[PDB]
Amino acid sequence: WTGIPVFKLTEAETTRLLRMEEELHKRIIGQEDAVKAVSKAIRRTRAGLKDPKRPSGSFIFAGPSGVGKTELSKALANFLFGDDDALIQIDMGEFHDRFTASRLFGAPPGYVGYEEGGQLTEKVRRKPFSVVLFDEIEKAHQEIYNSLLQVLEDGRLTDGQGRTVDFKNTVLIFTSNLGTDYERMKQKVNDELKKHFRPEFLNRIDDIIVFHQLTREEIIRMVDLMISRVAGQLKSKDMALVLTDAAKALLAKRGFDPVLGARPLRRTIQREIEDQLSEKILFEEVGPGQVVTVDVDNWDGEGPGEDAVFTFT
Amino acid sequence: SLVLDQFGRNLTAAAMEGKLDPVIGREKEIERVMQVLSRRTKNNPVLIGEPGVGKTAVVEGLAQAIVHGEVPETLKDKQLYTLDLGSLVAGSRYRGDFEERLKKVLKEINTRGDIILFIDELHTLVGAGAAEGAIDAASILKPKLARGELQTIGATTLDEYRKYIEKDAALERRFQPVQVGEPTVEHTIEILKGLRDRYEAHHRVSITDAAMVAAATLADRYINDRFLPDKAIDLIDEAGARMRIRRMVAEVDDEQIAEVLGNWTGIPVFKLTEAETTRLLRMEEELHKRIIGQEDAVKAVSKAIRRTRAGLKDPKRPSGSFIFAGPSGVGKTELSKALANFLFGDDDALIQIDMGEFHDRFTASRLFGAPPGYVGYEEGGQLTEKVRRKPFSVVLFDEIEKAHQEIYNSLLQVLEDGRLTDGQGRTVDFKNTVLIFTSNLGTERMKQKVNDELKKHFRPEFLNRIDDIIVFHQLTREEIIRMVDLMISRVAGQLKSKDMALVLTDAAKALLAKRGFDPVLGARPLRRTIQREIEDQLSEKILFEEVGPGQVVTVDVDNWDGEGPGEDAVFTFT
Amino acid sequence: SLVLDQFGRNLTAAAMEGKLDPVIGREKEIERVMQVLSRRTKNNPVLIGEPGVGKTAVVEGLAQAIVHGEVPETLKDKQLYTLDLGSLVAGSRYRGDFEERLKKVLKEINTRGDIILFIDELHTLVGAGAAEGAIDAASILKPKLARGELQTIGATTLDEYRKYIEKDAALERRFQPVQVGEPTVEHTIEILKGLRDRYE
């Protein structure tokens, strides 16, 4: 009827639930605390022991930019529903104005736009078991926080139409950028949140998670896990990509920067490999039924490699 | 049967002759609706779903299941009828005719007892003979639907279920919701495999596996205002139509549906022809015809769009996002204009929005429209509808420093995921757009100064979202000489419209170059010089009848050695 | 035909006497709309365009193509009728006259099979007479356009398209958007050269 997975725990889904930390780790590298907390939340939800009034899960994500705060939520949505589109993505960046709070729950009666009701309220009513993402929560005003102040404790919200929607089976995730060796920046993030967010609001969130900074082993795994996307895109045109170990080492070497996130790795691969592949494809260097072997020339594998180049077969 | 035919259509009798489309992949939905239909009391399901997911296909699938005999004992030999409420209300000069027709219909289907009734586009029950609070069809059906002696199924959409059914809770009480999910890409693949035969027979053509595979792929990837499998079915139907037109056995392949998608949504996702291939590999010189210098930016944008055209561009990020930083006048807007001319042939196809007007915090609602309950809700956003007219377009943000941080906060989602939710609540696609941001900031050393100024005046996540950071360098003497070349070229092009021919000597051009070199150059200076010392004299001479039409004008120089400052030099117009 | 003349005007009969101005340079739009009319299911295009570009001129060019007979076999010997929604909804004085008239018109189209409809000001299809006990024409024509036994074309300004047609996703579903863009400079010159004879 309503899609809420209050079922008998079969063996397959049980074995999936015990091992879902690895399943989230298939896409999310690092951030073991956040993945563990999400696993505990979903285990508490599916075991039937939960506070009826409170939602299934409420968390706030903070840390550097591009550390998978949104990606963990997207992977969780893919885990629960089978696709990334099912995630309710409400972006708080266009809610800088105070008067824009009506976009969430709807228009009051007597005004224009009363008939279609709210936006997130309707989407919650359609899919009661869904994860709702609020990106850039620091960037909207604190006035809009008050509508969610009810659902982070009671899980009920009243639209402009007047009907009450429920948030008891929804997972709420908030992502911010406050603060931006681990515990000092964790305390800095805590102080930033305490000064910027009212303490009465912060107590209604089940857990606060500080995202850890990306390290070298994380980015060397990241190169493979993200070039898998390029390989899969190439497979749509009967193209095969393989990277040498030196290719991975050079890609991680030129994209390592602790002050930014993983988007530098995207920049590195985009400016080094993908553009060259596009040039060779449109110049017909490689054709259908052919594989591509990318190797690093003029490098030892240990130096910084300011002169290393990529060879294509 | 003698009464139902006058006001309805037998779907089972249609299934006798096989006029219905075969339905595949909806076994779960069929089992759910039959599970509702097997109830004792209040056994009436409703097909709730998005427009274009196969809600009707559910009921023809049910009819096919009945006529094949897959049904259990409770649904055997049940004639299935869709009901035209328009046929009920038509021809009723008095109320007695209308609800007499309705009571005769319900009495007949109760007496026979083997008719399942279908209501298509269900919301019309609230108000049939009169208003909601008077006698209508729904009020008559309340005792029959409540006690559950009548089996009725219906289909409605989410917005309609919210705008017609839900405001009267009595209607939604008697209907169990059964959601018809939008099929996945492989699900639409099997659906296309199933419906291959009818379209191949009608259009007298042949369709290959790669054809509808690529059709489903591009349909899910690119079009963001329609829903599967409907748009892919539309593409297959019109593609068979195009081949049938072109013949007066043909084969339907991926290049045809690619050309169709280009015709429909304007996306140039085509099988690359040789001429446009050589154009794309050599478009750097084509850009260098208009914008001269700044090789790094031209090469970067060339690489980005070469990625876009080769199908190697990431679906969830846009085609390309760039910050154009440098001193004023170098040609940052000229580069975007040149890309617009290359992509579309015209400069008006470039959607240009200035950030100077967004100098206040209250101006943030202009891009994506007004919140509900306020003025300006009906027309919606400004940039969102402009993107909606043309999915493949380049957007320009002139003088990005004048904008304040709330604009970048509202645009971070466009930079990263490439979606934008308007005030209406609809998501607007940006996966086929090119992002251009022009900055005049920081004025080898200029690179560091510009980067420091950008990281000072922008948040770290915004500079993380942007793809490539480009610092425009100051022009050179050869570059301003080629500026003079372009200037005299466009001046002569304007002059040819009035039966006049224009030419300049090398010495005059060198004098123009000598009077047009400073670090405050670009094009805003040395165009003042042209308009003052060449255009002014030409207009002056042509208004009092010298150098008129039919005579070629040559611009020379006098009292100059060709090397000095040329302050005493005077332009001569022969 | 004995019922349709009281509610519509035959553009094919207008094309018999050449009462429509010649159309120049709209080959791409006319071939696209002719392609959409060749479909089996949901063969109903809409000419979305800025007002004053010649959305009605595209339909007149279709009529000229029909009378000159260069259309493929799927449009041979078919009359193009425009539909006057006002005349349909004008004389009712009751509740059931409008639906009876619309059903009679659709029955005539079904029993003839050589009529293509054109609806000026398409957005009036939704709420084409909305009383307390009235059912609009849009819901009546939804099943007819869904399967495709009814073939119609429409012209709509993008603004009013977004105001009314987009608000009802069901009517958006049955309709194929065909964009009629602004003519270029040389296109305007060619159109003026075409119209020069009639204007002199």
Ligand SMILES: Nc1ncnc2c1ncn2[C@@H]1O[C@H](COP(=O)(O)OP(=O)(O)O)[C@@H](O)[C@H]1O
């Ligand atoms: N652990 C991870 N696994 C996979 N991708 C990651 C991970 N961390 C970061 N990314 C990359 O970061 C990008 C998303 O960053 P995001 O978390 O949205 O930053 P922010 O939360 O500041 O907006 C994605 O493109 C993704 O490739």
Ligand SMILES: Nc1ncnc2c1ncn2[C@@H]1O[C@H](COP(=O)(O)OP(=O)(O)O)[C@@H](O)[C@H]1O
């Ligand atoms: N599984 C399927 N098999 C065959 N055709 C399908 C299937 N799913 C959808 N379709 C086609 O897509 C269209 C969906 O129409 P639908 O959305 O049910 O109309 P409505 O919105 O009025 O219920 C139908 O015309 C049908 O031909």
Ligand SMILES: Nc1ncnc2c1ncn2[C@@H]1O[C@H](COP(=O)(O)OP(=O)(O)O)[C@@H](O)[C@H]1O
């Ligand atoms: N190198 C150039 N080639 C051709 N035209 C140019 C060049 N530089 C500037 N222009 C002209 O001068 C104008 C200046 O544009 P731009 O440098 O972007 O201004 P700003 O720096 O204030 O954004 C452009 O619109 C263009 O028409």
Ligand SMILES: Nc1ncnc2c1ncn2[C@@H]1O[C@H](COP(=O)(O)OP(=O)(O)O)[C@@H](O)[C@H]1O
């Ligand atoms: N190719 C063409 N040849 C001749 N006239 C044209 C052409 N294109 C447009 N027109 C002119 O456009 C006008 C039709 O505009 P129309 O579509 O009726 O606008 P609206 O839909 O706003 O009423 C006619 O008067 C016609 O003369």
